[PDB]
């Protein structure tokens, strides 16, 4: 929502309130998504300034406030900055920005990230190139220098983030993505490799001096249909946890498959079906083990551009004897969303 | 303050800066409110969208930022989401919303919550139905389906919130409230019962498989007078602490009494007097013990709809030999408030 | 950016997104500023309401969100309230405000706080009077009661803030500052003394029942030139740390010198040079030791009032055998800033 537009600078304030509850069998400790209150809220701004006829500068900030916490010590659990960056965009040259932003491999994994609540399981945060990561300098080019419409690409430099935990750390890396869009279809591929930190190497699970993440994707977004498919492969990058021996690390190799189909009815109801399967391989002590494996059946009711209800059902196919202890129960999310 | 109003969605941004200092005898450790800097700030939004002529959707978010902290490790102490919810309101049918919101029993305890700084002692947060609680689905009906003016009611389902601490947890519950308003008067009553969590049961103080909170109230809000009275009773719900044996839990039974009288002078000065007395009973090892017992004398000076000063004096009647260790000293709050 | 202006209340929303990276030799553990991602974002409001023709009320809130954190446990590290206060301003009488605000001695140290990223090293936060401190009641008078133009002064009462750590605590204090501005020049002096807390006294480093901070300054801000110089002296106030014996406390005495020179080119480039030297004396076990000692060479490119790039180089003169373990390596900051 544009709240300022004077003297060649415009600022949009964005926010949503999401009333959200998850339902699962017991405590939800052996379920896909958990059990209980998951209400959150989001606030941010997006400003673009016209420096000259060809040059424009921008900045985005986006923050998540959890409303499912109390007023005691747990008051901040889940609060985080999603995105926070600035950059410059010139004519038909491209754009450059640095900050906390989407990894370039999310240019591909975003195709199947359309479920009312869930989906996009492989797009972990603070995981190199698949999700929101800190310290990324990203060059992007749309319409290939204004010569070929629909043909976009991007190159990204990931800065080293040596943090307290191996889960949220990374070393230097490079990545890129190419995409084409024609008459309703979009195809995309993205790749990224980076150095691992010593602390990551020192974990039980995962072994290798380099992490690697790539993925392809196809989508059809027209005539009220949304159909998409993603395939991705990772090396030493997907974060895993053994809930039995209570160790953590990274999967030496994962094969990721995400499918999704939605139809948008005129009167606002948007049903969806989806498949998601992530298989880890060469896991220390375990061997092969599935991380994610479900079918999804859901629907969102759009009242208008500002209000929506949704239900999302996960038919979890993960077996009860999963070697890594991955939860095997189903989970249902029921949501009510005000956004501007 | 309305900052957006285009295409049937309006958004209000709200905020206040509250310069605030408390004065007490020693460290304030044996006082009502404490001693030192209590400056805070608040920010939120409130959006309502017109879906059709009869249906409207809304969302509220409200956040508290403490300014009395430092820039070190204590930087977030007191920061919290007060409210965060969305819902739908239809014609003369009623409204429904889910999220972190006021407990339905606060429909009654809000009558005496009008002191410049203090008062409303029984409306604890994260305490079932008396204050701000997370995961509440609330149906509300004003003017009894548009048939009887002044006659409002509400029913509320409290979701289970199993947290790390027994103080901030709760199980499933139901509650409701009815109110009538006529020629300046308002009468109200509210009730709520809920299951306790196992962790709550396992505490030294309090015993029972169910928590219970109810209260009645009368107010007179006209001719520049504000007069209100509240009476409430709780079972296994009021959080208590024994500062001697350093244990905590819940009071098996409390009797709550809150009175308040204010007059609003034309030139902005609004003096107030108030009484508050909360007596816990059947406390393990202690027996009977008062939790709150004071007289209040204060005044607010309203410069206008955006600026105010206030002083609030608590004449604390709690005895120095209180069995639970409740603080017995007086406390004075001096405040300066900018709000929009 | 003014987002509301109805009925004699105006509200400005402010924010910036700062993409920022520091470069240093190894881990940055022996460097001036460190090494890695330093992206942050800021949001706040500033409201002023016209109560009558002579009286106006105001309020400021300003918050810092770190974007260089992850989404795990370190998600809030660095998040803080910078400022949060309200007050009243009357005609030619002056202004009064209370809250978390700038110490009065910053009226002087702000002269040399103009580097693209660094500088202003002596203006520590939560350090009595030199930086952002909590619980300050400040009277300010501009143009000496409207009689002498350019002649401003301020008196400040610092409230006691007894916190968990000795670094961020303080006792009661008073301070003041006087400044004159004439044909492009500004001269200033400020003084402040305060009681130390018992916890501060109990530290290894620093000894004395009272803290003391004063400083003078000259600036020339015209004809596209910025030239400034600061000299300050502290007693028992400057926070120090011995990274060898891993102790902390306060310096019994510091001599502070800050110089800065900048030129603003028409086409947006603003190069800068600066010197900064802070010498601690009478340090327990150490004797004399330098805390800060560098030359700075940097430049900011201003695209316009909303967008800028900058590079800041610190030529660190601190010797590798510094007795307190102060880092001796150079550091380079590269920044891109969107602000409104
Ligand atoms: Zn965003
Ligand atoms: Zn995103
Ligand atoms: Zn509110
Ligand atoms: Zn409230
Ligand atoms: Zn500010
Ligand atoms: Zn400041």
UniProtKB/Swiss-Prot annotation, chains A, B, C:
The record's induction entry says: By growth in low osmolarity conditions (low sugar or salt); activated at low osmolarity by OmpR, repressed at high osmolarity by OmpR (at protein level). Levels of OmpF protein decrease in a lon/ycgE double disruption (at protein level).
Disulfide bond is among the record's keywords: no
The way it spans or sits in the membrane comes to: Multi-pass membrane protein
Q: What does the record say mutating residue 117 to G does?
A: In strain: B/r; AA sequence
Compartments where located:
Cell outer membrane
The residue ranges crossing the membrane are 1-6, 8-23, 39-51, 54-66, 83-91, 94-100, 135-141, 150-159, 172-182, 184-195, 211-222, 224-235, 253-265, 268-281, 292-303, 306-315, 331-340
Q: Taking the first listed entry, what is the main subcellular location of this protein, grouped into a coarse class?
A: membrane
Query: Per the record, GO CC terms?
Result: cell outer membrane; membrane; monoatomic ion channel complex; pore complex
Q: In Gene Ontology terms, what is a biological process of this protein?
A: monoatomic ion transmembrane transport
User: Extracellular topology: which positions?
Assistant: 24-38, 67-82, 101-134, 160-171, 196-210, 236-252, 282-291, 316-330
Q: What happens when the gene is disrupted?
A: Leads to decreased susceptibility to a number of hydrophilic antibiotics including ampicillin, cefoxitin and tetracycline. Deletion of ompF confers resistance to colicin E5.
The reported effect of residue 262 to L is: In strain: B/r; AA sequence
Question: Which terms are listed as keywords in the entry?
Answer: Cell outer membrane, Ion transport, Membrane, Porin, Protein transport, Signal, Transmembrane, Transmembrane beta strand, Transport
The UniProt entry, under Gene3D superfamilies, shows:
Porin
A family per Pfam = Porin_1
Q: Which residues lie on this side of the membrane: Periplasmic?
A: 7, 52-53, 92-93, 142-149, 183, 223, 266-267, 304-305
- Supply the InterPro entries for this chain: Gram-neg_bact_OMP, Gram_neg_porin_domain, Porin_dom_sf, Porin_gammaproteobac, Porin_Gram-ve, Porin_Gram-ve_CS
A GO term for molecular function: colicin transmembrane transporter activity
Quaternary structure, from the entry: Homotrimer. Forms mixed heterotrimers with OmpC and with PhoE; other mixed heterotrimers are also probable. (Microbial infection) Trimeric complexes with colicin E3, BtuB and OmpF can be cross-linked and immunoprecipitated.
Per the entry, what this protein does is:
Forms pores that allow passive diffusion of small molecules across the outer membrane.
Similarity remark: Belongs to the Gram-negative porin family.
Domain comment quoted from the record: Each subunit of the trimer has a water-filled pore with a narrow, elliptically shaped (7 X 11 Angstroms) selectivity filter which has a solvent accessible area of 30-40 Angstroms(2).
Protein name in the entry: Outer membrane porin F
Q: What is the lineage of its organism?
A: Bacteria, Pseudomonadati, Pseudomonadota, Gammaproteobacteria, Enterobacterales
